[PDB]
Amino acid sequence: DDKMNTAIKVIHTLKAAGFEAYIVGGAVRDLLLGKTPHDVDVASSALPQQVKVLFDRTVDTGIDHGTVLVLLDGEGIEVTTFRTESVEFVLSLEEDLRRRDFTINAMAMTEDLKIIDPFGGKEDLKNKVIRAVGDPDERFEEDALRMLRAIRFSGQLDFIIDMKTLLSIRRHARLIRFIAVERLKSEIDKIFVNPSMQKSMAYLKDSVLTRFLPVGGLFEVDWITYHTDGNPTYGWLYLLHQQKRQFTDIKDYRFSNEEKRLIEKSLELTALNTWDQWTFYKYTLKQLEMASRVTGKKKDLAAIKRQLPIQSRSELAVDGWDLIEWSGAKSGPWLKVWIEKIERLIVYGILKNDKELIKDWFEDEY
Template sequence: MEFRIPEKVHYIINTLNEHGYEAYAVGGCVRDMILGKDPEDWDITTSAKPQEIKKLFRRTVDTGIMHGTVTVLLDKDHYEVTTYRIDGKYEDYRHPKEVSFTSKLEEDLKRRDFAINAMAYNPHSGIVDLFGGMEDLKNAVIRCVGNASERFEEDALRILRAVRFSAQLGFQIEENTKKAIREKAGLLRNISAERIRMELTKLLVSDNPDRLRLLYELGISKVIMPEFDRMMETPQKNIHHIYTVGEHTIKTVSAVAGKISESRLAPRERTILRWTMLLHDIEKPGTITVGEDGQHHFHGHQEKGAETAKRIMKNLKFDNDTLEAVVHLIRWHDYRFSLTPKGIRKATSKVGKEYMPLLFEVMYADICGKNPDIIDDMLKELEEAKKLYTEIISKNECVSLKELNISGKDLIKAGFKPGKEMGVILNQLLEAVIEDPSLNNKETLLNMAKNMGGK
């Protein structure tokens, strides 16, 4: 079986071979190549020691030389080249205390996580598959190399990676691997928040985010996000819902942002929307009440949910921009639009023009996760709101202070004193313009301000 590998990868492998060393492309790039995908990164493994690698290439960086990794720079591209190694004892359920180099490819491959990631390739030898990776790819299965419990004890992040690969590839997790996950899920307490966030995000933005359910079924979310377990176990007995909060959440995550191949949204927006849907009803379990008619209500879950989402995302070390966007969208996700131009201008002023397109995506997904018998009218209303919003944007109607055709400087020139009162006047002018967009010209606004300020 022969594959086309990038010229520069070929050059590195050939250079090492010509000097008497073994060298292979290894891991995820081999898996993706077999699946007919374009690998994002190319990792190379070799029998050459780090200092020997450095001698053969003009530009290198010691990225992880203690663990055998040297980065080879070719023009603007960089490739990690790692010596075959055997990992020593793992002390923190994540990293080996020490590594030793070996001349045997098999020793290097057997320390890897899953059989589909434990294959090597070069043009001379073809695919080296010692642990049944090809068979697992054919059967669409995620299975640990060797003893699953041992693999998870070495590096507990592999527990989350199993679910993430299941979501990214659309594969099932093999039964022994599942059993070991259930037994070892508690070890995730040893893994850094940043690593957990990265794996969860990759799972969420994949084309199979419904694999979130595995987090609950395998006891993972109990450790890394117990709030998700509460959602999975909270019923919603009312006319709008037929699913538990958790099942509704999974359906909404799947309904937002479309397939990756559609490229409808930028990666950042996709991340924001998927995390918003995961957390949008996070506080329904904490706000549930039962009405006289036996119906469940969740008053205030939006505001309380926004605060809980903020705490969860802070704990997961999210960047501020993503955190603020998700929290803002959760706060407004249940807003009821008044379906008039004025009503949509008011909504846009409150929510913010930069968030409205994302809020429409959130609302669409939220509706899709509700009782199928009642969603048609809700979707029609949402379409009407979007249509009105598009008209407002096309007419360039004012919905914020920065779009008002008068500023604080203009008021100061007209004799107003800087301070709190001036801010109140500007906000009153904005309210008037939202009511009637034709008022948004400087002269009219200045006269209105003078009347307001008693000038």
């Protein structure tokens, strides 16, 4: 890995220019746990334009919130000025930390590996406890998504949620209605792929969040049989399938068109009593695999699809214009119907994908 080393470089450059700078947030948590951080954030007394003077290559997306992304040695380090939440730049590191979400995320490390832990992150980290920084009620009123993010952290770290924190989530769970469903779906998609998911869903019910989340009750299914395949979409498919419900019931979460096709097509497959060659031809392997997974089948799906005489309409040896020729009839919607009859006869290995043979077949049936 190189992200930690690079951030140390960034810290060092910032400090030579007279500024304070520290590793902050989740990387500190991850190191202290013995895990390689996926991201490293640097917190600094520097202001965004001051950061930009010190580094050749920078991305300026989040300057309004105070974040400059520094590109160096092939890595990307986010450099944020001290701040809270409507953003307000502040002057000290402890003004920043005292408004973050949870104690294990409210720590900072110096260039010389000293850790600053005003709010007991280190003891909470050793006890495996997600606890709000300071007053949980205030933390949740500042951003209600934190309530949900606490659940995502329990499964991501195999931690329990602190008792007072969890009772604050229960009292304030209703504020979840103000959060953009894009952010709600992002956290949920993380939970669906993370470990300790069956405990994460128990928290989602215990926290009363399922009472107020968009169609929150649908989450309360039996998650014993769920085993993530690394794709969050399989989480959404599982809960619908368990309840014999359709995609329309979850449309609130604003899926992509491609994601909605995977769910809808998969449900079609699970509703289908017998799969034959036409099934393997029309549906993507990714759809065939997901539907096997929810119904429990261990089939060798890829090989059955590979063995089919053709793979897609592309390969068909005739098109609507051949049929116009042979039929002597004008172009119309009928073409599609007949092309499909021909397509089935070829996928089933009855008719040979050969223009002259298809014409013979066509002459006799029309």
